[PDB]
């Protein structure tokens, strides 16, 4: 039974990702988040061990649930007549990166470096496990404020990672690459790198660079905040119009702007506590 293993709390929010409640696992008072997804809204389905048919989101979370990482951990799930219920780990205290940037404004580069580094490791983890997130954005990043650790959430737009072209997309348009806008085609890793350029600009300038299709495809990055030349270069490299001109994850993490990152605990003590 699901209502006897967890005490359900207030609604945290709802959207294209379903409805998410705060919760507590009764056995050990572990804080959890309880996500409800309507079966009629699930576009992509998968099968797991023993071929049980589940939402792709459950398949993807199981593949990245391996151990500890910068990804939200799926603890359990249940099928109901018209929905699936997902039990997720819940950091406390927590704030998502969108609200954080709204309240702080443009982040100091030392802080953006630490956050961006942890997002890179998280996305590398997903790709290592065969999972493409397809919706990297500040809204989909939780900050564990006491530990200074970032966690990726909301895999409901993701897919199994492949090397052939993708022709479907349900992530966030203002983070999607110009080859999607123009041709409704993209490849996984290069599209992910584009969204990471959007995210890095978002961090160091206080908001995303583009709102309209014409801006996404136009290929001009105007900096609205003082940003070091090394960071501008990395951003512009990630936002190369031609996908093959974008850096690999290795080239991002080897970029001069990315060196000497703070540890998560240092990040919390210096910038979050």
């Amino acid at each position: 039974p699901l209502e006897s293993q967890y005490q359900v709390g207030p609604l945290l929010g709802s959207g294209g990702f379903g409805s998410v409640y705060s919760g507590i696992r009764v056995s050990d008072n572990l804080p959890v988040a309880i996500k409800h997804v309507e079966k009629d809204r699930i576009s992509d389905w998968g099968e797991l061990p023993n071929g049980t048919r589940v939402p792709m989101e459950v398949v993807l979370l199981k593949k990245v649930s391996s151990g500890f990482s910068g990804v939200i951990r799926l603890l359990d799930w249940f099928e109901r007549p018209d929905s699936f219920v997902l039990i997720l780990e819940r950091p406390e205290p927590v704030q998502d990166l969108f609200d954080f940037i709204t309240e702080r404004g443009a982040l100091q580069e030392e802080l953006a470096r630490s956050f961006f580094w942890q997002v890179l490791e998280a996305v590398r983890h997903c790709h290592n496990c065969g999972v493409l997130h397809r919706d990297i954005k500040d809204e989909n990043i939780l900050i564990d404020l006491n530990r200074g650790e970032l966690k990726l959430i909301d895999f409901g737009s993701g897919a199994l990672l492949k090397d052939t072209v993708y022709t479907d997309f349900d992530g966030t348009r203002v983070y999607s690459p110009p080859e999607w806008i123009r041709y409704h085609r993209y490849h996984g890793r290069s599209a992910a790198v584009w969204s990471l350029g959007i995210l890095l600009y978002d961090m160091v300038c206080g908001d995303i660079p583009f709102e309209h299709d014409e801006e996404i495809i136009g290929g001009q990055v105007f900096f609205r905040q003082r940003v070091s030349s090394e960071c501008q270069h990395l951003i512009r490299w990630c936002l190369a119009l031609r996908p093959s001109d974008r850096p690999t994850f290795e080239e991002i993490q080897n970029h001069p702007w990315m060196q000497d990152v703070l540890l998560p605990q240092e990040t919390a003590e210096i910038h979050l506590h």
């Binding site: 809204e139 909301d154 349900d170 966030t172 203002v174 206080g206």
Partner: peptide
């Protein structure tokens, strides 16, 4: 300048 969330899914 208006900063806003954007839907997905």
């Amino acid at each position: 300048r208006k900063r806003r969330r954007h839907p997905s899914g």
